[PDB]
Each structure stands twice: as structure tokens, then as C-alpha cells.
Amino acid sequence: NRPNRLIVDEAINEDNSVVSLSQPKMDELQLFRGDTVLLKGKKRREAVCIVLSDDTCSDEKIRMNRVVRNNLRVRLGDVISIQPCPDVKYGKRIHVLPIDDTVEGITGNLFEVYLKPYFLEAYRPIRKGDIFLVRGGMRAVEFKVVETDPSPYCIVAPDTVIHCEGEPIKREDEEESLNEVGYDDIGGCRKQLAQIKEMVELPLRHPALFKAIGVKPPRGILLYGPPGTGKTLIARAVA
Amino acid sequence: NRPNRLIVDEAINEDNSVVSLSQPKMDELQLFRGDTVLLKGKKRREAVCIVLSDDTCSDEKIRMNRVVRNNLRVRLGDVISIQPCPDVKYGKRIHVLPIDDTVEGITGNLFEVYLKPYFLEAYRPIRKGDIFLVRGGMRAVEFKVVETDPSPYCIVAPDTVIHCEGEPIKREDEEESLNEVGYDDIGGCRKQLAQIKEMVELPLRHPALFKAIGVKPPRGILLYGPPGTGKTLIARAVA
Numbered sequence: 088n089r090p091n092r093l094i095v096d097e098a099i100n101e102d103n104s105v106v107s108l109s110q111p112k113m114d115e116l117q118l119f120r121g122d123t124v125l126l127k128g129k130k131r132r133e134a135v136c137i138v139l140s141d142d143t144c145s146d147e148k149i150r151m152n153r154v155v156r157n158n159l160r161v162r163l164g165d166v167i168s169i170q171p172c173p174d175v176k177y178g179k180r181i182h183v184l185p186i187d188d189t190v191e192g193i194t195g196n197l198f199e200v201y202l203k204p205y206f207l208e209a210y211r212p213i214r215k216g217d218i219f220l221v222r223g224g225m226r227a228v229e230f231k232v233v234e235t236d237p238s239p240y241c242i243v244a245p246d247t248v249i250h251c252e253g254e255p256i257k258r259e260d261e262e263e264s265l266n267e268v269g270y271d272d273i274g275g276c277r278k279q280l281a282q283i284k285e286m287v288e289l290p291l292r293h294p295a296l297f298k299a300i301g302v303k304p305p306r307g308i309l310l311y312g313p314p315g316t317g318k319t320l321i322a323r324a325v326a
Numbered sequence: 327n328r329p330n331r332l333i334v335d336e337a338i339n340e341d342n343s344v345v346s347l348s349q350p351k352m353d354e355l356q357l358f359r360g361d362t363v364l365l366k367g368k369k370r371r372e373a374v375c376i377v378l379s380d381d382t383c384s385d386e387k388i389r390m391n392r393v394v395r396n397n398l399r400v401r402l403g404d405v406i407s408i409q410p411c412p413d414v415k416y417g418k419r420i421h422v423l424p425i426d427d428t429v430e431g432i433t434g435n436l437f438e439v440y441l442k443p444y445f446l447e448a449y450r451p452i453r454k455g456d457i458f459l460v461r462g463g464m465r466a467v468e469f470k471v472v473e474t475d476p477s478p479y480c481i482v483a484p485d486t487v488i489h490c491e492g493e494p495i496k497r498e499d500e501e502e503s504l505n506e507v508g509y510d511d512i513g514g515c516r517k518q519l520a521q522i523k524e525m526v527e528l529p530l531r532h533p534a535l536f537k538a539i540g541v542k543p544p545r546g547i548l549l550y551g552p553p554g555t556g557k558t559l560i561a562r563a564v565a
């Protein structure tokens with residue numbers, strides 16, 4: 088049955104690009120804590136990240152972040168195949184530009200003052216055709232690459248140079264904005280949010296199974312608490 | 327007055343094809359506990375089942391199941407004639423197929439994995455033009471025969487072979503779906519359900535008698551209890 092694909096869930100870590108697995112995971116694929124990992128999915132697209140070792144998260148499970156779930160076009164309850172990729176990469180020239188939807192009121196240079204400080208001491212990889220999201224600068228902005236060195240061989244380094252043209256390109260309907268609300272945006276409701284997972288993930292992720300079995304799913308859920316507790320973004324995130 | 331026909335009622339046994347009678351019943355028709363019985367009715371159709379001996383059900387009464395009440399087109403308050411039929415039968419080739427109304431989401435082979443396991447150690451008979459119902463497999467599905475060996479001589483055996491064509495035939499309005507609610511679907515309400523039998527079976531089963539006598543039937547029945555006790559499927563089953 089090809090025991091290599093595992094289900095996807097939410098990661099409790101607050102890091103940006105960190106993938107956490109269980110102890111008997113890197114011992115089979117002989118990968119270290121700072122190796123290069125390549126992930127695939129639908130739409131004939133690939134991905135690259137950094138695998139981090141952890142033995143406190145769970146017993147046998149792989150964590151997976153939100154900034155790359157929308158990037159690789161992956162949703163919950165899906166299978167993902169992981170394999171090591173010991174390929175030496177080195178970025179030479181990069182060219183990123185933001186979308187004209189979140190750059191209102193920003194003028195002047197914006198590449199040598201935000202991007203350069205956060206790239207160093209991170210060595211984060213990047214693949215062709217990906218929309219990364221960065222927090223900071225009293226705002227939430229993103230950038231998209233359209234033309235750089237041929238994939239892959241993309242490694243951030245202070246010696247790398249950057250350039251701009253001066254004409255942002257509008258986004259399309261294929262991607263989804265990460266500025267909206269997700270499971271990571273809920274704080275404090277752990278036990279209560281854990282219940283909705285085992286009541287709304289079965290009928291919404293597996294429709295043919297429900298139109299196959301005779302089980303009746305719940306037809307209504309009532310949330311409680313005083314106003315402002317977060318009854319609205321929970322429903323928006325689970326959607 | 328031909329003392330051979332008896333009224334029909336509901337059977338408390340949970341078995342699929344079991345007919346229970348009283349002690350002075352098989353002693354007149356010299357039939358054993360595992361003989362072959364042939365039953366007739368309207369529409370010039372016959373039936374075949376297995377008579378089971380019981381001395382705890384009642385004093386002088388014949389039980390009769392739901393899966394064959396709709397099959398032989400029999401309703402309550404009707405007469406049924408029973409006679410032994412010591413005919414040796416042996417099935418050779420069978421060909422059953424389901425109706426395209428309850429096979430949504432089912433693919434692959436479905437004859438050597440469900441039908442074969444449940445047929446053995448049962449020796450259940452089957453007549454031509456009957457819609458049997460089987461419970462199990464996390465669903466409620468049925469099958470209908472359209473072409474097999476000439477009637478009767480239909481006995482299930484592991485040596486028998488089966489085949490399929492690949493085109494289900496839709497059901498007609500002559501038969502009724504057994505997936506709906508009947509008296510056997512009510513659990514717990516025994517004393518209360520027993521009362522509705524002696525108040526709604528007289529005016530609905532014998533209309534000419536009520537338009538003959540001057541008795542006024544009840545014009546309204548009020549059911550009680552907290553929600554979910556089953557006030558709705560009781561009314562749907564008695565209809």
C-alpha cells in the first residue's frame with residue numbers, strides 16, 4: 088500500500104518554515120536536522136522546506152505549516168509524500184515584487200531595509216512560483232517571483248543581488264490570500280476547538296463517504312460564550 | 327367455511343426469514359421444522375419460506391415477517407392459506423443485480439464478498455420475481471433477479487455460480503421500498519403502540535363495514551412525550 092503517505096494536520100509551533108515529525112521518521116529516510124526536503128502535490132508543483140526534529144509533538148505524525156499549505160495547494164485530510172533530496176543549491180540573482188493589493192501607502196525603497204535583515208541567518212529555501220508571507224514592519228505584506236535563475240539553485244545569501252522593474256502584477260484566483268483567518272489565528276480555545284475537528288471534518292472533507300454510508304451527520308452546532316470570545320472567526324476558519 | 331385461512335399480524339422475532347406458528351398447526355399439515363412451504367396471495371403470485379416451530383409466541387396464531395409482506399404484496403387484516411409442499415429443489419445458476427437507487431458510491435466487485443458469505447449455512451429459498459432485503463455492510467441494499475433457471479428449483483449452495491451484465495434496472499411503482507419505517511422499527515413502545523392497533527386498524531382496514539354500521543370512529547389521537555420519543559415514525563408506520 089506504499090507506506091509513505093501520511094495525513095496532514097495543524098502545527099502548534101509558531102515558527103514560519105519548520106516541519107516537525109516523529110522519532111521513527113528521519114531514521115528511515117536518513118535525513119539530518121538541516122537537510123533539504125522536497126514535497127509535491129496537485130497541479131504538478133513541487134515544494135522545498137527545512138525538516139526540524141522533535142520528539143515532544145506526538146508519537147507518529149508529521150506537522151505542516153499554513154504559509155506553505157496554501158502555497159503547495161494542500162488542504163486537510165490529504166496525503167503527502169516525503170523523501171530526502173541531497174542537492175547542493177546556491178542562489179545568485181533574485182527578483183521579487185509584491186502584489187498591488189497590500190502596498191497602499193508605501194513609497195521609496197523596500198528591498199534593502201526589510202528583506203535583507205530577515206533573510207540572513209535563516210537560509211530559507213524558495214522554489215519557483217511560490218507566494219511566501221512575511222510578518223513584520225507594522226503590516227502583513229507578501230512578494231511573488233516572476234523571473235530569476237532557473238529552478239532550483241535558490242539559496243538566500245547576503246552576497247546575492249536583487250532588482251526591481253516598478254510594475255506590480257495583480258494576483259489571480261488560483262491562489263488564496265493568507266491575510267484571512269485560519270486555525271492558527273485562534274488563541275485560548277484549545278479544548279473547545281478540538282471538538283469541532285471531530286464533528287465538521289468528516290462530512291466536509293469526505294462527501295462521497297457520507298453519500299455512501301447511512302450515518303446522519305450533525306445538522307447544527309451552537310457556539311456559546313459572551314460577545315468577543317471568538318465565535319465568528321472560528322466558523323470562518325473552519326470554512 | 328374452509329378453516330384454512332388465518333389473519334396476519336406482526337412478528338416479534340428479529341430473524342429475517344422465519345415463520346412462527348402455534349402447536350396445533352404443523353400437526354395437521356404434517357410438516358417438520360425444516361420443510362418447504364408455499365404461500366400465495368393476490369396478483370397471481372406465489373412465495374416460499376421456512377416454517378419454524380414455536381410454542382411460546384401465542385396460543386393459536388401464525389407469525390409473518392415484513393421482508394416478505396411487501397414481497398408477496400400482503401397487508402394487515404388479510405387471509406393467508408398455508409399448505410406443505412414437499413418438493414426437492416436445487417439451484418444451479420443465479421443472476422441477481424441491484425436497483426440503481428441505493429448503489430451510490432459503490433464500485434468494484436460486490437458478489438463474491440457479501441452475497442457468498444451470508445448465503446452459506448442458511449439454505450434460504452427464493453422464488454421468481456422477488457425483491458429480498460439484506461442488512462449489513464454499513465448500508466441497506468437489495469437485489470432483484472430478472473433471468474435465472476426456470477422456477478422453482480432455486481436453492482442456495484456454494485457450488486452455484488453467479489454472473490452480472492453491468493446495467494441496473496430501475497424499480498417500478500408496483501413494489502414498495504423496504505427502507506421506510508414499519509412496525510418493526512419501533513423500539514421500547516410496546517404497551518403504547520398496542521393501543522393504536524385497536525383504534526386505527528378497524529376504520530382503515532375495513533371501510534365498507536364503517537359505512538355500514540352506525541359506530542363513530544375516533545376523529546383524533548394525541549400522542550405525548552418529550553421530543554425524540556418517536557411520535558412521528560409511529561404515525562408514519564401505521565400509515
Ligand SMILES: Nc1ncnc2c1ncn2[C@@H]1O[C@H](COP(=O)(O)OP(=O)(O)O)[C@@H](O)[C@H]1O
Pocket residue numbers: 272273274275276313314315316317318319320
Ligand atoms: N479567542 C480568540 N482568538 C483569536 N482572536 C480573537 C479571539 N476572540 C476575539 N478575537 C479577535 O477579536 C476581534 C473581534 O472579535 P468578534 O468579531 O467580536 O468575535 P465575536 O463575533 O465572536 O464576538 C476579531 O478580529 C478577533 O481577531
Ligand SMILES: Nc1ncnc2c1ncn2[C@@H]1O[C@H](COP(=O)(O)OP(=O)(O)O)[C@@H](O)[C@H]1O
Pocket residue numbers: 511512513514515552553554555556557558559
Ligand atoms: N421509540 C423509538 N423507536 C425507534 N426509533 C426511534 C424511537 N425514538 C426515536 N427514534 C429514532 O430517532 C430519530 C429521530 O426521531 P424524531 O423524528 O426526533 O422523533 P419525534 O419526531 O417523535 O421527536 C428517528 O429517525 C427514529 O428512528
